[PDB]
Design a binder for these strands. Structure first.
Lengths: 50, 80, 148, 113, 122, 198, 156, 335, 58
RNA sequence: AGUUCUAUUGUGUUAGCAUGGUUUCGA
């Protein structure tokens, strides 16, 4: 019977971790400077190679 | 023809003499000084009125008088 | 006296939920002694909870008792209280002897029975929420002044 | 973890200075394996009482700024001491970033209802 | 503050918005709407119309009761228009005269609607 | 049906008297989308790789709350009835192209990169990128399909995560090892004991 | 700090308000303590003693208020509360309207302008209900409006 | 038309009298669907019928006091438990949720109001317009004086009748923590939409401070033990940042949370449009929508998106011409 | 299954406050629940108030 | 009773800051 509880524990922690990912996604979206610096970085990369 | 069915008898409507608060008993000598100070900031005195409610504590030189027994017996005799 | 025992009062916790969903129970029987809201056996709040505990003794669960109690008391309002009120109100309309046309020496000339049909004169309705009665008295006053 | 800092500028602070100040700060962030989050502005703010800072003068108002970042916990001390030496900055404070209460995800429906 | 030491070197944003808003709504235009807010809008959704009130009142009635009730109404109405004021042909008012005609037209209209078009549904 | 469905949210009801922003984006979007694939005609709606559907935010209150968009307008994508990245308003021209490029990749001719500058510049009168598949795109496609237990389609994506790349092992390494096990446990014949042990 | 303005008030009246302001904030108590140096041991016992005397004063102050309030109103409360006591209206005249069952009985023991006023008043009511004078005055019986008129034909 | 001046534009809705204007019946149009024709046709039977009525129906009597001083206090206090987040008021506009539309006692007003207007046949019949005008002023005065008669629970009622003030029992200030009745205004601010109070909430910390700027005790603010410690920290930090006074209460110019200045404006305007429906506010937001796309407009969009009830109402009216009342009966058939 | 409770004795000692003009704690602070205290339900029968917060995640 | 994870923190240590009684200064 102990093995049965093992599966339940994995599901319980899995749901808790899922909610944590949503909070971090908000920050990314809400962040302006992060996106701005990231955007710029990419552009220069291709120009140097071309 | 839609009035109340029961008469109005609530305490709020009709003020009465009572104490809506509980507190531990206090020594007679301790509370006597406090009451005197309030009276200085200007029928039976307030000290005697509060004693009937059993507010003070039974100290060494102050004990609650016993109830009237010798002046409260009223019996009737009849055959059986 | 050895058989005496102390039991837990279950009404303290059960009554909290009843008032939360239906907080319009304190208005009834407010001016009577014994009732506090800062309750008597006759109070609606005590009556409703009494049935809930009695039903649970048979085997019903705590949540199931609420549904059964709500329906049991609902019928009394619509089958007895509503019927009684409506029956009595009907008789008022019949009292049209004051009109001159009621007896000849025809189209009625006075609107006395018409007003009583909508429940405005000596025939008042019975609501459940306390807000309805608060606004009802307002209407009365409004119409009273205009008459003058 | 994430961190927040509220910096109150003065009237004697131009846009030139603000850009310089922020650039300096970013150096430390990167040093300690960090990255800037976002930078915003709050405009001017009225002060309840006069501020008397030595060797600076007297001021009645200033420009309130806000910027979020993230770095090693040991970088807070270095940052705090740098602000004090620099002119213009009369008052500042560092507040740790919370999960629910924040200026990023929670900024709507505060005063209204 | 009277003292010329407060915030001065700033741009007014409030006025900008207002200025640009006159295009969609002139200053001389109304300041309030009849619909009102949430409190007002709820009222309009509860009040009923004159025609709606009549249908609800007589919703529980049936054909066997409506026809009998209507016939009683017109029966007494006519009695008060032929022998009420003795024999007259020019009353000063047109209260019952105008009500009698309206009720009469309804009865005639009902006769035309037998089932839909024909006696049989085939 | 198409698994990818792009939902274009906008509020043009308030701008019926004076277009400010809602109609500005429609003019450019309607002229650029057709050129990059070669509101819209029904004939050209079938050749697209995703289902383009338009919904009015300020017309239906039930839908407005479900999306919960802090801004207006904004492009919202979907994949097998699931939330995806949302493009915020006010972005640059490069951001718009990025969003469209990834939209057509999830479903899996296209305009070659050599002729990308002319298409974008020529569509602005009305008034793809050289990067390969994204690492996150492949991972998101394998995590959801494994529940369906595919046979032939699962092998293809398994082989496209390791070949002449040797650049991403800390993120895609975990799923690569477990992906092979599922394939071996799908064949009708018994698996090989030696293969599983290794 | 406290500031007050005098407007249509005597200086003596205004000065009485600021004096009581210090008592709430203990301005006088704090001013004297700092003047003289007090040993830490004394404060240890003084701080604890003030936590037992002040609470007792509040309870006694409320008791005095009831005495003054009751003195001007007299009366007194007693052990009058009892569950076994139905609070029914005394004399209780207002009652439901007669159902026509008792109306007829009333006329049977009042036939004998003062006492004969009811004659021809209530009698016409009964005739009107039965439909004797007017064709539209006929009412409905109590036995034909509840069996198949309200328990089945309900609007709900 | 003839000389027809209803009471809706000659008696009330001017100066003081426009403060409350409760709608009785809806208006669709003048000439249109069958509802418009019925409204005027039913009116035609009326008017002239008001002249032949008898004078016996006029049951006019003096209005005596209804609620006494000792009784109004109990009703006022017991009515706060049902809704501790709002103040008691005569909300006549939301009577539908408590009174059936058919059994609405307000219906009488409609009929009565029309009568008064109709009764003013003396404008030019007997004395002419000369004296008519004079009499009009009389009625306005009468109604204005008696405007307080429609609120027994209000202080106006007592002033009219001239009754002495009440004398409630002296309630002790020191109470056990079990019993507490915080004021409605401060109770709502404590919850803060289930968000702990921080240093940014400057508009809420101003209530928990005395005249001298000292921290109030737990027996005055009436707050829980957990939030009491949090509040002390928020106010303490705000003072260190030079964002709060030190010996006096804040001013009107510092009652704003720590947020985007632009956000404040937008948020502020949204409430006005929802309470009274300011036209100016709506216009402002419209422009700002495009100008500042990077702003939150969830509440503004939701309110406008909820206006679909007006469009659906047209379908009900259209089917009403064909005797389509089945839509109303089904909704009422709930039981 | 049948299991009996365990001993209430625990490591450490009772709270102690350092003497002298320097007020400081020695082992434990004021927020210390002894092992013989009653259940929290009986000590706080009132429970959270209506205006209390339903999320103490500060 | 004990270990892990999660919410909670006027309990130990801690260098710069803000405010304040006393004290100090007088282009």
């Amino acid at each position: 019977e102990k093995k049965v509880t093992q599966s339940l524990q994995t599901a319980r922690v899995s749901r808790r971790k899922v909610a944590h990912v949503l909070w971090l996604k908000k920050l990314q979206d809400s962040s302006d400077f992060l996106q701005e610096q990231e955007e710029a970085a990419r552009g220069v990369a291709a120009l140097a190679r071309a | 023809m839609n009035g109340c069915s029961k008469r109005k008898s609530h305490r709020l409507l009709k003020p009465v003499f009572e104490l809506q608060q509980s507190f531990p008993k206090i020594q007679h000598w301790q509370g006597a000084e406090i009451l005197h100070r309030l009276k200085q900031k200007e029928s039976l005195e307030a000290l005697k009125l509060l004693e009937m409610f059993k507010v003070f504590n039974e100290t060494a030189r102050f004990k609650y008088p016993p109830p009237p027994v010798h002046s409260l017996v009223r019996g009737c005799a009849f055959p059986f | 006296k050895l058989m005496d025992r102390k039991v837990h009062n279950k009404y303290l916790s059960l009554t909290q939920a009843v008032l939360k969903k239906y907080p319009n129970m304190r208005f009834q029987d407010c001016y009577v002694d014994g009732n506090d809201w800062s309750y008597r056996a006759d109070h609606p709040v005590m009556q409703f909870v009494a049935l809930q505990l009695r039903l649970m003794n048979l085997g019903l669960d705590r949540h199931a008792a609420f549904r059964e109690a709500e329906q049991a008391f609902y019928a009394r309002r619509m089958q007895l209280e509503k019927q009684q009120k409506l029956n009595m109100a009907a008789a008022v309309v019949a009292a049209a002897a004051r009109d001159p046309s009621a007896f000849a020496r025809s189209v009625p000339s006075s609107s006395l029975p018409r007003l009583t049909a909508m429940g405005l004169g000596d025939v008042q309705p019975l609501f459940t929420s306390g807000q309805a009665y608060w606004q009802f008295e307002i209407a009365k006053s409004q119409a009273n002044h205009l008459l003058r | 973890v994430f961190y927040e800092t509220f910096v109150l500028f003065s009237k004697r602070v131009q846009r030139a200075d603000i850009r310089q100040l922020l650039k300096q700060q970013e150096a430390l962030i990167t040093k300690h394996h960090g990255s800037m989050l976002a930078v915003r502005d709050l405009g001017w703010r009225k002060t309840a009482f006069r501020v008397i800072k030595p060797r600076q003068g007297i001021f009645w108002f200033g420009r309130l700024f806000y910027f979020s970042f993230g770095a090693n916990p040991a970088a807070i001390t270095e940052m705090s001491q740098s602000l004090q030496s620099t002119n213009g900055v009369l008052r500042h404070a560092t507040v740790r970033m919370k999960k629910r209460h924040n200026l990023m995800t929670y900024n709507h429906h505060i005063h209204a209802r | 503050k009277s003292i010329k030491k407060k915030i001065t070197g700033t741009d007014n944003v409030f006025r900008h918005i207002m200025e640009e808003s006159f295009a969609v709504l002139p200053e001389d235009g109304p300041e309030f709407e009849e619909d009102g807010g949430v409190s007002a809008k709820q009222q309009k959704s509860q009040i009923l119309s004159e025609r709606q009130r009549a249908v609800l009142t007589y919703a529980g009635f049936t054909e066997a009761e409506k026809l009998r009730l209507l016939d009683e109404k017109i029966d007494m109405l006519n009695k008060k228009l032929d022998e009420d004021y003795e024999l007259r042909g020019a009353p000063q008012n047109l209260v019952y005269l105008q009500l009698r005609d309206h009720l009469q037209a309804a009865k005639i209209s009902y006769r035309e609607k037998l089932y839909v078009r024909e006696t049989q549904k085939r | 049906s198409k698994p990818v469905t792009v939902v274009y949210a906008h509020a043009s009801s308030m701008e019926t008297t004076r277009p400010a922003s809602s109609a500005s984006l429609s003019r450019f979007l309607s002229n650029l989308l057709p050129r990059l694939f070669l509101l819209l005609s029904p004939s050209q709606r079938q050749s697209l790789p995703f289902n383009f559907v338009t919904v009015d935010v300020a017309a239906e209150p039930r839908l407005g709350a479900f999306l919960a968009l802090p801004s207006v307008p904004a492009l919202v994508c979907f994949y097998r009835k699931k939330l995806y990245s949302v493009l915020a308003p006010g972005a640059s021209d490069v951001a718009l192209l990025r969003f469209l490029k990834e939209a057509a990749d999830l479903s899996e001719s296209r305009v070659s990169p050599e002729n990308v500058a002319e298409a974008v510049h020529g569509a602005r009168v009305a008034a793809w990128a050289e990067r390969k598949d994204v690492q996150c795109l492949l991972t998101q496609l394998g995590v959801a399909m494994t529940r369906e237990q595919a046979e032939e389609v699962q092998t293809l994506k398994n082989e496209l995560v390791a070949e002449d790349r040797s650049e991403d092992a800390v993120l895609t390494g975990g799923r690569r090892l477990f992906a092979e096990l599922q394939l071996q446990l799908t064949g009708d014949s018994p698996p090989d004991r030696e293969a599983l042990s290794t | 700090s406290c500031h007050r303005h005098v407007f249509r008030a005597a200086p003596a009246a205004v000065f009485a308000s600021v004096q009581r302001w210090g008592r709430r904030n203990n301005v006088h108590k704090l001013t004297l303590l700092v003047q003289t140096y007090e040993k830490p041991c004394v404060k240890r016992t003084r701080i604890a003693e003030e936590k037992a005397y002040y609470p007792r004063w509040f309870y006694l102050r409320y008791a005095t208020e009831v005495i003054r309030y009751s003195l001007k109103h007299h009366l007194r409360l007693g052990q009058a509360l009892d569950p076994n006591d139905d609070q029914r209206l005394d004399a209780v005249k207002p009652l439901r309207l007669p159902s026509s069952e008792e109306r007829r009985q009333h006329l049977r023991h009042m036939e004998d302008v003062k006492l004969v006023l009811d004659i021809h008043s209530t009698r016409e009511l009964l005739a009107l209900e039965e439909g004797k004078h007017a064709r539209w005055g006929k009412s409905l019986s109590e036995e034909e409006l509840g069996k198949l008129f309200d328990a089945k034909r309900l609007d709900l | 038309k003839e000389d027809r001046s209803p009471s809706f534009e000659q008696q009330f809705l001017n100066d003081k009298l426009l403060g409350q204007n409760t709608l009785q019946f809806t208006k669709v149009s003048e000439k249109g669907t069958a509802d418009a024709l019925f409204a005027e046709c039913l009116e035609s039977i009326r008017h002239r019928r008001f002249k032949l009525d008898p004078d016996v129906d006029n049951r006019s009597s003096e209005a005596v006091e209804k609620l006494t001083q000792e009784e109004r206090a109990i009703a006022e206090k017991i009515f706060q438990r049902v809704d501790p987040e709002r103040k008691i008021a005569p909300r006549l506009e939301s009577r539908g949720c408590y009174i059936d539309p058919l059994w609405d006692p307000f219906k009488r007003v409609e009929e009565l109001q029309q009568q008064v207007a109709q009764d003013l046949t003396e404008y030019a019949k007997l004395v002419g317009a000369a004296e008519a005008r004079r009499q009009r002023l009389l009625v306005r005065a009468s109604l204005r004086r008696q405007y307080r008669m429609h609120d027994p629970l209000s202080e106006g009622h007592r002033r009219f009748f001239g009754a002495q003030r009440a004398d409630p029992f002296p309630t002790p200030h020191r109470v056990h923590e079990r019993f507490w009745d915080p004021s409605p205004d401060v109770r709502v601010a404590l919850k803060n939409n289930n968000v702990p109070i921080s240093w940014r909430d400057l508009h809420i910390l101003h209530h928990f401070v005395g005249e001298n700027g000292l921290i109030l005790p737990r027996r005055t603010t009436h707050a829980s033990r957990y939030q009491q410690r949090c509040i002390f920290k928020a106010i303490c930090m705000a003072r260190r940042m030079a964002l709060f006074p030190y010996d006096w209460k804040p001013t009107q110019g510092e009652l704003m949370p720590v947020m985007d200045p632009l956000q404040y404006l937008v948020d502020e305007l949204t409430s006005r449009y929802k309470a009274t429906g300011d036209l100016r506010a709506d216009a402002m937001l419209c422009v700002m929508l495009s100008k500042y796309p990077k702003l939150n407009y969830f509440r503004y969009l939701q309110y406008k998106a909820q206006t679909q009830k007006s469009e659906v109402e047209a379908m009900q009216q259209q089917e009403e011409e064909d005797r389509g009342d089945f839509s109303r009966l089904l909704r009422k058939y709930k039981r | 299954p049948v299991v009996f409770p365990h001993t209430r004795a625990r490591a450490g000692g009772k709270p102690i406050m350092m003497r002298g003009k320097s007020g400081k704690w020695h082992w434990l602070g004021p927020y210390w629940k002894p092992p013989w205290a009653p259940s929290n339900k009986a000590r706080w029968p009132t429970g959270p108030e209506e205006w209390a917060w339903s999320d103490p995640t500060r």
